[PDB]
Amino acid sequence: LNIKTMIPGVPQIDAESYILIDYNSGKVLAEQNADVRRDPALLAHMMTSYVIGQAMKAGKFKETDLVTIGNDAWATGNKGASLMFLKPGMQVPVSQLIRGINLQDGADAAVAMADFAAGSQDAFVGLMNSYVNALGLKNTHFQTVSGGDADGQYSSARDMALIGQALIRDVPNEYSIFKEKEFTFNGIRQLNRNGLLWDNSLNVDGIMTGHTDKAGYNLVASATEGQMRLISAVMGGRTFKGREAESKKLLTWGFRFFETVNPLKVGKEFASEPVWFGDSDRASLGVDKDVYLTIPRGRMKDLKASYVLNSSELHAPLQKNQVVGTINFQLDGKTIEQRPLVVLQEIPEGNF
Ligand SMILES: [Cl-]
Ligand code: NA
Numbered sequence: 613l614n615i616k617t618m619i620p621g622v623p624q625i626d627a628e629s630y631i632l633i634d635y636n637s638g639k640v641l642a643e644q645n646a647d648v649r650r651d652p653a654l655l656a657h658m659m660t661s662y663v664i665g666q667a668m669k670a671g672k673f674k675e676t677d678l679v680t681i682g683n684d685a686w687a688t689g690n691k692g693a694s695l696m697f698l699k700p701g702m703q704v705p706v707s708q709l710i711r712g713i714n715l716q717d718g719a720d721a722a723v724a725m726a727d728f729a730a731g732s733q734d735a736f737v738g739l740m741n742s743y744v745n746a747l748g749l750k751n752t753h754f755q756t757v758s759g760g761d762a763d764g765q766y767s768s769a770r771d772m773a774l775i776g777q778a779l780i781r782d783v784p785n786e787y788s789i790f791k792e793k794e795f796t797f798n799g800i801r802q803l804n805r806n807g808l809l810w811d812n813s814l815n816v817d818g819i820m821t822g823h824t825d826k827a828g829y830n831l832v833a834s835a836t837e838g839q840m841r842l843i844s845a846v847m848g849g850r851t852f853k854g855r856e857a858e859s860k861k862l863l864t865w866g867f868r869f870f871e872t873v874n875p876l877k878v879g880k881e882f883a884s885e886p887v888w889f890g891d892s893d894r895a896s897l898g899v900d901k902d903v904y905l906t907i908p909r910g911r912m913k914d915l916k917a918s919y920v921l922n923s924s925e926l927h928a929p930l931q932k933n934q935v936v937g938t939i940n941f942q943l944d945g946k947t948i949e950q951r952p953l954v955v956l957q958e959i960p961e962g963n964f
Contacts, residue, residue, distance in 0.1 A: 616910060617944060620869040623861050628828060628848025629769040632862050634872050635777055635834065635841035639906035641866045646770040649751045650847050654822025655767070655830050656760050657718045658775045659740045659752075660725070661820075664710055665779065665786025666743075667729045675707035679728045681720075688719040688758050695800050698724060704798070711789055712797045714804070714820060719758040726757045733757050744771075747778055760824070773845040776819050776832045780841075791817035807856050808833060814863060821855070829855040835863045840872045873912050875941065876903045879956060882939065883919055890928030891962030900933045900954045905941055907948065916942040919953050930959040 622642045629645035640646075667673060681702040691697045698704065698712075698720040706728070712721035726736035733756070740754040752775075755765040767775075779787045793804050808816040818834040829849030835842055844862045849855050876882055882898040897919070907915060921937035930936070937953035 618908075620865070620908075623865055625846065625858050625862065626850045626854050627846045627858055628850075630844065630846045630858075630862065631769040631773050632842060632844045632866050633773050633777070634866075634870070634904070634906040635780060635843055636872055636874075636902075637904035637906040638777070639870075639872075640770075641842070641870055641906065642862065643770070646773075646845075647751050647768050649766040649768055651760070651824070651827035652765070652767040652772060652822070652847070653760050653824045653827035653830050654718065655772055655820050655832055655847075656754060656765060657713050657722060657822075658772065658779060658820050658832065659743065659754060660713055660718070660722050660736075660757055661710065661786055661789070662775060662779055662783060663736065663739050663743060664713075664725055664729055665783025668706075668786065669783055672729065673706055675705065675710070677706050678703040679706055679709055679724055681724050682727060684727060684733065685720040685724040688723060689717075696798060698798070708795075708797055710786070711792070711795045712802075714790065715795075715797055715802050717759050722757045747774055749774060760822075760827075769845040769847050772830075772832050772847065773843050776834055776843045776845065779819065780834060780843075787818060790819050806831075806833075808835075808860060811860065814860060816863070823849075823855070831856065831859045833859045833863060835867075837867050839874075840867070842866045869909055870906050871909045871912060872904055872906045873915065874902065874904055875915070875917060876939075878902055881956060882917075882953070885921065885926050885936075887926035887928055887930060887959050888964060889961055890930070890959040890964055892959050893964060895926050895930055895936070895959055896956040897936065897953055898956050899939070899951055901951075903939075903951050905949045907943065911943055914943055918942070921953070928959045928961045930955045932956070932958045 631643045631646040632641040681698045709721045726733045730736035744752045749771040751768040752771040755762040816835045819832045830847045832845045846859045884894045887895045934955045935952045939951045940947045941949040
């Protein structure tokens with residue numbers, strides 16, 4: 613009812629679905645049909661990139677390793693021109709192939725990497741589906757690594773934003789690939805088709821874009837402003853003209869009306885409480901995971917922190933990171949965010 617306590621209107625987005633989330637807090641800022649199962653088109657390669665990134669993180673291979681191209685990679689919609697051939701017998705560096713997945717149809721480079729990383733396309737696809745389970749995605753399923761007609765291949769705006777968040781969070785060295793405006797594939801210079809990388813009003817460093825007639829226009833974008841990072845997923849975009857415009861509009865809106873606060877870090881003492889029957893007198897209390905809250909912009913000065921304990925008194929023995937209560941964060945008297953209150957240091961039984 614104030615200009616201070618206002619609820620912002622969401623801009624009109626000419627697309628079938630969308631979601632906008634904060635990367636750190638995972639807070640959902642805006643959504644429409646975010647769980648509707650859709651053709652992801654070329655965004656499916658975000659999951660391809662994710663699995664590849666996990667393989668490299670785990671030291672399975674390196675960007676300098678040479679990959680031989682098979683007949684499997686050649687058979688994808690079968691050189692009559694195109695110096696963009698991944699022809700059989702070639703041995704391409706992993707560096708070229710992981711970037712070539714992002715480029716044009718990633719089909720032949722994705723098929724080559726699938727065999728390299730997982731032995732076969734089917735096994736690799738099994739890995740994409742195990743990570744759908746690991747990431748908790750409820751509306752994503754993969755059928756193929758090449759391109760994406762595939763009638764049993766789908767995702768949603770939310771699930772695609774979550775894949776973008778995991779890419780950034782879990783495999784940042786693979787995520788770095790996405791901001792490169794240009795790279796050389798097979799000796800020929802390519803440009804990044806994420807045009808928002810050239811936007812000087814926004815700091816966008818990801819992620820992927822893809823259009824087909826059945827899937828419409830699709831973009832997953834990530835943008836930063838200081839320490840704040842937003843992720844948008846816009847899918848089933850209706851027009852060419854809005855294919856980057858709609859996502860820009862969403863991203864700028866989330867930065868204008870929301871700010872992400874970090875009230876408390878792992879290991880820092882939020883409160884202390886006395887503990888009975890221990891070797892020590894007081895329990896050091898806080899969190900086991902960094903607290904990130906996304907709140908209305910202008911409100912961070914007004915945010916109030918408090919806590920409640922699971923009990924009347926703390927009794928030893930207390931394990932490190934044992935949950936003993938709840939931290940509540942309030943604005944205007946109402947609790948908007950809660951986190952678990954843990955023991956920061958073990959208090960074994962004793963005397964006291
Ligand atoms: Cl993993
Ligand atoms: Na590695």
